[PDB]
Design an enzyme around this catalytic site. Structure first.
Site, PDB file in Angstrom:
ATOM      1  N   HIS B  21       1.073  -4.709   2.531  1.00  0.00           N
ATOM      2  CA  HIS B  21       0.667  -3.578   3.323  1.00  0.00           C
ATOM      3  C   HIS B  21       1.786  -2.542   3.347  1.00  0.00           C
ATOM      4  O   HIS B  21       2.904  -2.831   3.777  1.00  0.00           O
ATOM      5  CB  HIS B  21       0.353  -4.047   4.749  1.00  0.00           C
ATOM      6  CG  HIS B  21      -0.060  -2.938   5.659  1.00  0.00           C
ATOM      7  ND1 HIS B  21      -1.334  -2.411   5.656  1.00  0.00           N
ATOM      8  CD2 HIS B  21       0.650  -2.200   6.546  1.00  0.00           C
ATOM      9  CE1 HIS B  21      -1.391  -1.393   6.497  1.00  0.00           C
ATOM     10  NE2 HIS B  21      -0.201  -1.243   7.047  1.00  0.00           N
ATOM     11  N   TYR B  65       1.775   3.810  -0.281  1.00  0.00           N
ATOM     12  CA  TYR B  65       1.160   4.227   0.965  1.00  0.00           C
ATOM     13  C   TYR B  65       2.134   4.200   2.137  1.00  0.00           C
ATOM     14  O   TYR B  65       1.714   4.172   3.299  1.00  0.00           O
ATOM     15  CB  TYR B  65      -0.023   3.304   1.280  1.00  0.00           C
ATOM     16  CG  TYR B  65      -1.149   3.352   0.269  1.00  0.00           C
ATOM     17  CD1 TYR B  65      -1.762   4.565  -0.082  1.00  0.00           C
ATOM     18  CD2 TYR B  65      -1.617   2.192  -0.317  1.00  0.00           C
ATOM     19  CE1 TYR B  65      -2.818   4.611  -0.987  1.00  0.00           C
ATOM     20  CE2 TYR B  65      -2.662   2.217  -1.215  1.00  0.00           C
ATOM     21  CZ  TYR B  65      -3.268   3.426  -1.548  1.00  0.00           C
ATOM     22  OH  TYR B  65      -4.319   3.460  -2.437  1.00  0.00           O
ATOM     23  N   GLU B 148      -8.326  -4.618  -3.055  1.00  0.00           N
ATOM     24  CA  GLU B 148      -8.112  -4.109  -1.722  1.00  0.00           C
ATOM     25  C   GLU B 148      -8.771  -5.133  -0.816  1.00  0.00           C
ATOM     26  O   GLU B 148      -9.892  -5.585  -1.082  1.00  0.00           O
ATOM     27  CB  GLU B 148      -8.805  -2.758  -1.568  1.00  0.00           C
ATOM     28  CG  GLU B 148      -9.072  -2.314  -0.126  1.00  0.00           C
ATOM     29  CD  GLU B 148     -10.062  -1.146  -0.051  1.00  0.00           C
ATOM     30  OE1 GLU B 148     -11.274  -1.352  -0.305  1.00  0.00           O
ATOM     31  OE2 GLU B 148      -9.623  -0.019   0.254  1.00  0.00           O
TER      32      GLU B 148
END
Lengths: 523, 523
Positions: B21, B65, B148
């Site tokens: 993550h 991200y 994902e």
């Protein structure tokens, strides 16, 4: 399963079922005598499984297969005949054109040729639905809505044959009769009278030669093998003078602003023809067409650019051909090896007329413009298209979501994608900024989307996006609908998604490179 | 049906299932304290159905991200953490990302949000296969092989969180730490040391300025808002002199032959930057990157062309950046509105380094070159591609046939297709000249195919074929195999189908425009 190969919804039984068959010159009246398996040639196919008599539901597609086999490009076209099966015939539509699959799935002998089995009484018993015979149906081609019928040779013995059109009987020059008939398909539509165009061209060719400034400009010509640069140089000068002829006035107006129609392009064209036409070629129409057909830049002389055929009157087309002819006669001595006056005025004109007809016939046919369905939009070095046809459809009338993939890339160096303009309709077509992104070589870049004026929301990638040779992207737009109410045409401002490329200050104003993907609202 | 939405073959139960993550700067240590639904923000998605905690199996995709939300382009990157579910977890792979379909097909409440239901004990009972919880799996993106994971917020409370990498902790300039980590993916592979590149560039920038001929060439500069043509003119002169610096020697060699690397291109680049950078922009890195990221021609300074990154050493990259910096400082006064020395030497270098990293990261990623799979081959105005990925595969090991569709079109005026070169292997890969054709806007043109040297058969269309804006074609190649013996690599001469465009006498020899579609033999 039989439904793994047979499309029942498109299969039906018809009484007096007929179709068309293009016929070669020499066989128009013999074939009317009856349909029978030829004793010479492939008899329908290289593959034993697919040997059979072929017909199409479209008489214009049939016409394209009537040209002389020894001279396919510029040869005579025979005619078209309509063949009918008395009584009942079962047109069995196939979802697949693979003979092994069809034989496997229909539970047939895998040993015998599919087309032979199709004509057996037991097969006609199984799938004929009580019809006297079975005829297989397949999509004629991609970009076409016609069908191709494959008839068993034995069964086809029952076909009644009657003449549709005998082009040869029309007594027209070249392939004028065939293309004229084919033009009947579009009632737009380019329906030119080539007899008139043929006549005006020659009148203009002869006149152009008998024109002081012209025959004087010719005086300045080297009339000897000179360098291509000087050859193009002379030719552009020639073109500029030739175009002042009162018989080339309209063309003078119509070719003055679009760059593709420039004098330079006519000069470039003249040169290329001169460099490929030799004695043998010049004396043979078929070989001339073969040579001419592989040269670039014919759109200049044709007046075709940006998706439109600009020279669409007999008068203006004759002017361009005549001007091109004069220019080739001049280009030859400077970069050639034969009788300029000979080829230019005759075998050159006959052939180019032929290539005009080929090209007009294409623009006359139903087609997808750039950015529509899976056709790509090629611009500023980029190439974008909807990944599939379904992606180009924004379905309406329901609450839920949808995804739409757009393929993006560029020809060479790294070019940026600034963002994308998406259509929106409150409730009926909202952008789910969470599932909308752009993947560059697998790198999933998220978007920061802002609403704009006109029911358009501009989304920009959160990381710089560049595409080029070896770097490709997939823009995935995710739409969400809270309302099951259908989108109405009035609500749809613009009918395309707009991908923005690099920024250029063209017109003194910072304009972005615009790539458009056109959609359709459905359901 | 549940198999209409669930891909069982890719669904499995795993003990101690973990993923990654990406985490934003500020939350690297707080998140390690546990995974919980944020009280601010979208909580995973705009769509209620898809709200949940997101993770990926790829730590490098997670790293992308972690960049600061207010400064996505040039901001700091936080880190990456690995989250684990103690015990057994069921990764349920979905064939579809449409929540309404999944709820419908899995027979769930269509009223509640799918991600909420996923976390219920009854759902975990139905599809968990005895696992403590269910995590949904979807393809991460197109052109990507990662997945994902969508985790229920309540269920994700069980995740153990442990640090993978804290980029901020690395103490590197810009986003050096993130891109360096991402470069670890490819063990080719561009792994540059940007600390070194940063240092050499500045050394060279300072040195370039202290160079007689240079600071003298600068003397000749207008130092006033001059016309863009004279601006590019001066700049090209500048570049030519700047490049004679002994610190820019290697680059001098490496940029001398490839046109894209020309002085003109560096001048053109310098000008464009100068025209878009104003005071505000110059003072803000994020805004500088935003402006710079949408300009064309960055490949010139990057040394990227034809699918390859040519400047792949720290020394040569520093030379190009430094040279670009010097040139922008000069372009500004001639066509700008701010402190040239200021931007050029600092915010300009910081930003372009950033854009180099973005682009290198893309070329480092697995991708399809032109003519491979559905990637198009863009050349000479044409655009060709395999219609689908399956079309690009020539399957072997069986007796039968196969068909392969190739989409062909051009950007504007009518350009010809002379023919196509097809591979052949007697018995194992023969061309069925009967089913091989080219459809132009639905017009099905047959082929006259001749064998050639090297197990290649040249097929030419029986009617002239032209493609362009509004005119598109589909080449359908039909192969036939009489032998069930597999094709062996030795038998395969060339690995691509070669579509031939117009003819040009390039290199004094009549060369044809060559468009290649690369295939793979399978089964």
């Amino acid at each position: 399963g039989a439904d793994d190969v047979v499309d029942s919804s498109k299969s039906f039984v018809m009484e007096n079922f007929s179709s068309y068959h293009g016929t070669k010159p020499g066989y128009v009246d013999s074939i009317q005598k009856g349909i029978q398996k030829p004793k010479s040639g492939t008899q329908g196919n290289y593959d034993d499984d697919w040997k059979g008599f072929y017909s199409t539901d479209n008489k214009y597609d049939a016409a394209g297969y009537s040209v002389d086999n020894e001279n396919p490009l510029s040869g005579k076209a025979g005619g078209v005949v309509k063949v009918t099966y008395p009584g009942l015939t079962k047109v069995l539509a196939l979802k697949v054109d693979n003979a092994e699959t069809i034989k496997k799935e229909l539970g047939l002998s895998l040993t015998e040729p599919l087309m032979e089995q199709v004509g057996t009484e037991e097969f006609i018993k199984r799938f004929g639905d009580g019809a006297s015979r079975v005829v297989l149906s397949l999509p004629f081609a991609e970009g076409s809505s016609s069908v191709e019928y494959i008839n068993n040779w034995e069964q086809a013995k029952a076909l009644s044959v009657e003449l549709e059109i005998n082009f040869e009987t029309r007594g027209k020059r070249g392939q004028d009769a065939m293309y004229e008939y084919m033009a009947q398909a579009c009632a737009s539509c380019i329906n030119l009278d080539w007899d008139v165009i043929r006549d005006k061209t020659k009148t203009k060719i002869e006149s152009l030669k008998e024109h002081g400034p012209i025959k004087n400009k010719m005086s300045e010509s080297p009339n000897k093998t000179v360098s291509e640069e000087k050859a193009k140089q002379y030719l552009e000068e020639f073109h500029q003078t030739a175009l002042e002829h009162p018989e080339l006035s309209e063309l003078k107006t119509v070719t003055g602003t679009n760059p593709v129609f420039a004098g330079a392009n006519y000069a470039a064209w003249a040169v290329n023809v001169a460099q490929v036409i030799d004695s043998e070629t010049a004396d043979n129409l078929e070989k001339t067409t073969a040579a001419l057909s592989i040269l670039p830049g014919i759109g200049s002389v044709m007046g075709i650019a940006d998706g439109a055929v600009h020279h669409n009157t007999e008068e203006i087309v004759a002017q361009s051909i005549a001007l091109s002819s004069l220019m080739v006669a001049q280009a030859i001595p400077l970069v050639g090896e034969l009788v300029d006056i000979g080829f230019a005025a005759y075998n050159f004109v006959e052939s180019i007329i032929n290539l005009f007809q080929v090209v007009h016939n294409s623009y006359n046919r139903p087609a997808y413009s750039p950015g529509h369905k899976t056709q790509p939009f090629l611009h500023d070095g980029y190439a974008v298209s909807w990944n599939t046809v379904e992606d180009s459809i924004i379905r309406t009338g329901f609450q839920g979501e949808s995804g739409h993939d757009i393929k993006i890339t560029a020809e060479n160096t790294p070019l940026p994608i600034a963002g994308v303009l998406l259509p929106t309709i409150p409730g009926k077509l909202d952008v789910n900024k969470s599932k909308t992104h752009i993947s560059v070589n697998g790198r999933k870049i998220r978007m920061r989307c802002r609403a704009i004026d006109g029911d358009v929301t501009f989304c920009r990638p959160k990381s710089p996006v560049y595409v080029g040779n070896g770097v490709h992207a997939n823009l995935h737009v995710a739409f969400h609908r809270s309302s099951s109410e259908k989108i109405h045409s009035n609500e749809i401002s613009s009918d395309s998604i707009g991908v923005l490329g690099y920024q250029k200050t063209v017109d003194h104003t910072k304009v972005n490179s615009k790539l458009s993907l056109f959609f359709e609202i459905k359901s």
